[PDB]
Amino acid sequence: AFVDSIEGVGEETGNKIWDPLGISDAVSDEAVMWFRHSELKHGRVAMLATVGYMIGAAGITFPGEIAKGVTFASVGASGPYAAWDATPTAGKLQILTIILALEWAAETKKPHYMRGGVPGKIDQLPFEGIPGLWAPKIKFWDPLNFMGALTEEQKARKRKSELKNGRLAMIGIISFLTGHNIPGSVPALDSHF
Amino acid sequence: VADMEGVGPETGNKVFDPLGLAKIASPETLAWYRAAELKHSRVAMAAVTGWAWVSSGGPLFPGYLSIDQGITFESLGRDGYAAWAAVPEAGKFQILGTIGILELLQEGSVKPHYMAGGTPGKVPLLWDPLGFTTKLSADTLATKRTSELKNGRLAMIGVMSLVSAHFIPGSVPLL
Amino acid sequence: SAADGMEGISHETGMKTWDPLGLADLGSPATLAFFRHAELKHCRVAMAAFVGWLVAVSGVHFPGLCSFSEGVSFEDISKLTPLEQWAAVPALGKAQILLAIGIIEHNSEWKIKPHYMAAGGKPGDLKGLKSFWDPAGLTSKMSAAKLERQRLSELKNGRAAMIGIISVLIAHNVPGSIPLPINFPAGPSLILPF
Amino acid sequence: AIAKPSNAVPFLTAPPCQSSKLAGAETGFDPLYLSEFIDLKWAREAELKHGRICMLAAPGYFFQEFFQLPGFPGYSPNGIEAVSSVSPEALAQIVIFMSVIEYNSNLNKWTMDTMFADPKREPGNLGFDPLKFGENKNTRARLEMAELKNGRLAMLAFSGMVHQTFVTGKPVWASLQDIF
Amino acid sequence: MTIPGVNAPGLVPATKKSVGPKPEWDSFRDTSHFWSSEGIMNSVPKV
Ligand code: CLA
Ligand SMILES: CC(=O)O[C@H]1CC(C)(C)C(=C=C/C(C)=C/C=C/C(C)=C/C=C/C=C(C)/C=C/C=C(\C)C(=O)C[C@@]23O[C@]2(C)C[C@@H](O)CC3(C)C)[C@](C)(O)C1
Numbered sequence: 020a021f022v023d024s025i026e027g028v029g030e031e032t033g034n035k036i037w038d039p040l041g042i043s044d045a046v047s048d049e050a051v052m053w054f055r056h057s058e059l060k061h062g063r064v065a066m067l068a069t070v071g072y073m074i075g076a077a078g079i080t081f082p083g084e085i086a087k088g089v090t091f092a093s094v095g096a097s098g099p100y101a102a103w104d105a106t107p108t109a110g111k112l113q114i115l116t117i118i119l120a121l122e123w124a125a126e127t128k129k130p131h132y133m134r135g136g137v138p139g140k141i142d143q144l145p146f147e148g149i150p151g152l153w154a155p156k157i158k159f160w161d162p163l164n165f166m167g168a169l170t171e172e173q174k175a176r177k178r179k180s181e182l183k184n185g186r187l188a189m190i191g192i193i194s195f196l197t198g199h200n201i202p203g204s205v206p207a208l209d210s211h212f
Numbered sequence: 213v214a215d216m217e218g219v220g221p222e223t224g225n226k227v228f229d230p231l232g233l234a235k236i237a238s239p240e241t242l243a244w245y246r247a248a249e250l251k252h253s254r255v256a257m258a259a260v261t262g263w264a265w266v267s268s269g270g271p272l273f274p275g276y277l278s279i280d281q282g283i284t285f286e287s288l289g290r291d292g293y294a295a296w297a298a299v300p301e302a303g304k305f306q307i308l309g310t311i312g313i314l315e316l317l318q319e320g321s322v323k324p325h326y327m328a329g330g331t332p333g334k335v336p337l338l339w340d341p342l343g344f345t346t347k348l349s350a351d352t353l354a355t356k357r358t359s360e361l362k363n364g365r366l367a368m369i370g371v372m373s374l375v376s377a378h379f380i381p382g383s384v385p386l387l
Numbered sequence: 388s389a390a391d392g393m394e395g396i397s398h399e400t401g402m403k404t405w406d407p408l409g410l411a412d413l414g415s416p417a418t419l420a421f422f423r424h425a426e427l428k429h430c431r432v433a434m435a436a437f438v439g440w441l442v443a444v445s446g447v448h449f450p451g452l453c454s455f456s457e458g459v460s461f462e463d464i465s466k467l468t469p470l471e472q473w474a475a476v477p478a479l480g481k482a483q484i485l486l487a488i489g490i491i492e493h494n495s496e497w498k499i500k501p502h503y504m505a506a507g508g509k510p511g512d513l514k515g516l517k518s519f520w521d522p523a524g525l526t527s528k529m530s531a532a533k534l535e536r537q538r539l540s541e542l543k544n545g546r547a548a549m550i551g552i553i554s555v556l557i558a559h560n561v562p563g564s565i566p567l568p569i570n571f572p573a574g575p576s577l578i579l580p581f
Numbered sequence: 582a583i584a585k586p587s588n589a590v591p592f593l594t595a596p597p598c599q600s601s602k603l604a605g606a607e608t609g610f611d612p613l614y615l616s617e618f619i620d621l622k623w624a625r626e627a628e629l630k631h632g633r634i635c636m637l638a639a640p641g642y643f644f645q646e647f648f649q650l651p652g653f654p655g656y657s658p659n660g661i662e663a664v665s666s667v668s669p670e671a672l673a674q675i676v677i678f679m680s681v682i683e684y685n686s687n688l689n690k691w692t693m694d695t696m697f698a699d700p701k702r703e704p705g706n707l708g709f710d711p712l713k714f715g716e717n718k719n720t721r722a723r724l725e726m727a728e729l730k731n732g733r734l735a736m737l738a739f740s741g742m743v744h745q746t747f748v749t750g751k752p753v754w755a756s757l758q759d760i761f
Numbered sequence: 762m763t764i765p766g767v768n769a770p771g772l773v774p775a776t777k778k779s780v781g782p783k784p785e786w787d788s789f790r791d792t793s794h795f796w797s798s799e800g801i802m803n804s805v806p807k808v
């Protein structure tokens with residue numbers, strides 16, 4: 020929320036708030052919550068996308084039969100860029116609707132993030148507490164509870180690392196897509212991608 | 213970590229964690245690891261015993277596996293991968309469905325979940341329903357659990373050795 | 388929930404009342420008594436129906452003829468699939484079978500004065516209709532704990548039976564539902580009563 | 582600087598329906614302020630009746646393509662040519678059944694004043710509750726709000742199904758699956 | 762139907778018509794919806 024309390028300050032920009040254009044000074048502190056929720060969501064989606072894109076460029080795919088006749092290698096033949104278009108529309112819709120359920124359940128939680136909740140703290144158990152619905156209580160984030168061994172300071176440091184790696188992953192995934200769309204724009208990319 | 217079972221005098225009588233995976237584990241993560249280890253060990257023991265029994269001769273099932281297709285257990289092949297391929301796909305599907313309903317019952321029927329404060333890798337639905345080993349002492353039960361973990365890990369090695377012999381026959385000795 | 392004192396807690400789901408959608412909480416104790424009476428009726432009808440379906444598949448039939456007027460022998464009717472058997476029963480025979488069933492249901496709701504949707508419910512209690520349930524007194528040898536066990540077994544068997552009857556009825560009509568490859572009898576999954 | 586803004590359209594004044602005790606009142610959705618003109622109880626009686634009809638219709642319209650009443654003549658998977666093809670003396674009997682129910686339920690109370698002349702008589706409380714869910718008064722508000730919302734959604738859904746069938750000429754599920 | 766995103770690209774690039782000579786004022790005035798006799802008639806709602 021308030022641009023201050025948030026933890027994202029790091030050594031790369033000096034130990035200060037990095038707001039060159041003063042976007043944070045023209046908001047009423049209600050929108051800074053939305054910006055840290057969206058920043059963390061962007062960073063997390065971006066690092067997932069980055070590792071997935073690197074996997075696709077390397078050519079690693081599942082053993083086969085994404086669908087009935089289609090194979091994983093065949094549907095990822097033309098690199099990772101066209102892989103999404105190649106994937107079956109039905110499975111595409113199932114990915115989209117499970118993401119819809121996740122991102123609707125995350126929004127429906129009572130404290131929210133904009134209205135006085137933690138911006139970034141996705142609820143661990145999105146589908147519980149819903150009358151008339153049942154799910155097998157598998158918590159969305161950290162299902163195996165890796166974070167129990169971590170103390171407060173350690174998880175603060177790891178949240179800092181999360182923000183840094185998410186920002187770097189945003190830069191990386193945009194580099195990948197831009198390098199594909201404009202050859203030679205990202206010189207560290209080979210013909211694989 | 214040391215409170216849990218599996219540790220024995222072979223590996224210096226201390227926890228075998230060369231990569232330090234137990235140090236990043238909460239109590240529940242340790243429960244998940246132990247449950248996975250138990251399930252893998254017993255699956256590997258069943259698999260290696262079945263593979264050795266089939267490949268080393270001995271008795272086989274007497275009758276047919278499918279009257280409509282007329283497949284005999286003798287004609288399956290008496291070797292692991294090819295026999296499993298020759299099993300009808302419907303038979304494979306219903307075997308996997310039986311295992312799936314068993315595991316869904318294991319997850320949703322035992323009320324104290326092994327992750328949520330229950331014993332890791334216990335099946336009160338299915339373990340000696342008539343009580344073959346129920347009256348034994350607690351110390352003998354615990355050391356028998358230790359034996360289970362030990363030879364079940366050895367069975368993991370055995371079944372993976374059999375798979376690596378099937379796919380890379382020049383790797384293992386013998387076989 | 389409202390479903391704690393009720394006698395239906397199983398050993399398979401654990402000793403907690405399996406009401407994942409919380410339908411027991413929604414409504415009155417009268418509503419839950421209606422639910423219990425409906426469950427027991429479905430249980431009993433499903434046990435009788437599965438036995439009847441097994442009889443029809445086996446082909447065993449009464450020696451005689453259904454109607455001396457119409458040329459409808461039990462031997463003739465046994466050759467059809469189980470639901471076409473009822474479709475082939477005479478209209479008047481079906482009418483009087485339903486008349487007997489409806490008389491039984493009306494008297495169950497009438498003569499059992501402490502109603503299931505009322506104080507002193509006794510939801511599945513149809514004893515009170517004298518000589519209807521257990522005319523021979525077979526359960527009369529049983530104590531309280533044995534009676535409770537038998538009631539729990541009734542509910543378990545009937546629940547399984549109402550699953551199984553629908554399973555056999557739909558398995559052939561929609562192939563691939565039941566994983567087993569047994570060739571279930573053909574025919575409808577639903578018959579209109581007349 | 583609206584003194585009493587509408588909870589739904591906060592740039593408009595609060596309608597009379599917002600300051601009322603019927604169920605679902607807080608939304609306050611009434612841009613046209615029809616609650617000031619129309620009698621509010623009479624419109625909840627109409628809202629509930631329409632929603633009940635529509636939430637019987639929408640499952641019926643959506644499942645009559647998939648399923649047939651065994652042996653029924655004149656069946657067509659799409660509702661419009663279904664009603665065109667079905668014998669008129671079946672639709673007539675359905676309408677007679679509905680009319681009998683309406684007349685006997687609303688006997689001597691068919692006008693805005695005659696209906697709700699009795700202070701007890703509530704909007705849409707015709708007394709149809711064989712299983713007596715209404716005796717439990719803890720969940721009565723939940724069930725009332727759920728009935729209202731489901732009825733409204735069913736009105737919109739049935740309208741959409743019917744007009745999509747008009748657009749495409751094909752039943753609801755076929756028209757939907759030919760998009761993806 | 763081409764659902765943009767799943768069975769079709771989200772946004773297709775537009776046709777770059779290239780920089781070239783200007784049109785004539787009469788050319789785009791005798792086709793306007795308000796200063797052309799047929800343009801006026803082509804501006805009535807079809808419905
Ligand atoms: C607005 C409501 C509505 C209307 C006007 C119609 C109209 C029609 N339906 Mg029906 N239908 C409806 C709802 C409706 N349906 C619903 C909800 C279903 C369940 C999915 C069906 C399922 C259905 C089928 C499968 C078929 C029709 C067909 C027809 C046509 C012939 C009549 C017939 O056979 O009805 C049959 C009626 C039923 C099978 C049941 C109707 C359910 C009623 C409305 C529920 C009300 C009772 C209530 C729930 C009980 C309370 C119990 C309490 C006392 C305890 C006709 C165009 C036939 C067709 O396609 O012709 C072209 C046909 O074969 N309908
Ligand atoms: C050199 C040159 O010229 O150009 C360069 C520039 C250019 C184009 C930008 C390039 C690029 C791309 C870049 C920079 C890509 C960066 C990608 C990035 C930064 C990707 C992060 C992923 C993070 C993940 C998946 C995290 C998982 C995290 C998980 C699963 C966890 O929760 C771990 C954890 O649970 C444990 C196990 C237990 C605890 O102990 C701690 C926690 C709870 C946290 C190139 C190719 O380098 C070339």
Ligand SMILES: CC(=O)O[C@H]1CC(C)(C)C(=C=C/C(C)=C/C=C/C(C)=C/C=C/C=C(C)/C=C/C=C(\C)C(=O)C[C@@]23O[C@]2(C)C[C@@H](O)CC3(C)C)[C@](C)(O)C1
Binds near residue numbers: 258261345366
């Ligand atoms: C030099 C050398 O060796 O090279 C090897 C190395 C290499 C490559 C690894 C090889 C291998 C594979 C090996 C060694 C594989 C070994 C596999 C192994 C050793 C597999 C055990 C299974 C045990 C089972 C199924 C036990 C069930 C036990 C059951 C059913 C019970 O319930 C037990 C119990 O009822 C009792 C009996 C008494 C009760 O009180 C307690 C209970 C109720 C619990 C090669 C290829 O062979 C060559």
Ligand SMILES: CC(=O)O[C@H]1CC(C)(C)C(=C=C/C(C)=C/C=C/C(C)=C/C=C/C=C(C)/C=C/C=C(\C)C(=O)C[C@@]23O[C@]2(C)C[C@@H](O)CC3(C)C)[C@](C)(O)C1
Binds near residue numbers: 437525537549
């Ligand atoms: C997995 C898969 O794919 O398929 C599987 C699962 C699936 C689909 C469900 C299948 C099915 C169908 C199933 C399982 C069907 C089950 C049917 C069932 C369970 C049917 C019970 C009838 C009971 C009656 C009539 C009892 C009357 C008993 C009466 C009237 C008594 O007097 C009892 C009595 O106690 C008293 C009251 C007093 C005592 O003094 C005397 C006795 C003891 C006599 C399959 C295809 O088969 C196999």
Ligand code: KC2
Binds near residue numbers: 278301303567569
């Ligand atoms: C542990 C696993 C398991 C269970 C729990 C289980 C239970 C039941 C039940 C009890 C409810 C019935 C009623 C039943 C019936 C049939 N089973 Mg089945 N079965 C299991 C495993 C296998 C395997 C491996 C095969 C198989 C088959 C058949 C055939 C086919 C006969 C034929 O085609 O002549 C029929 C009729 C074979 C097959 O489908 O071959 C194409 C086949 O290979 N089953 N099976």
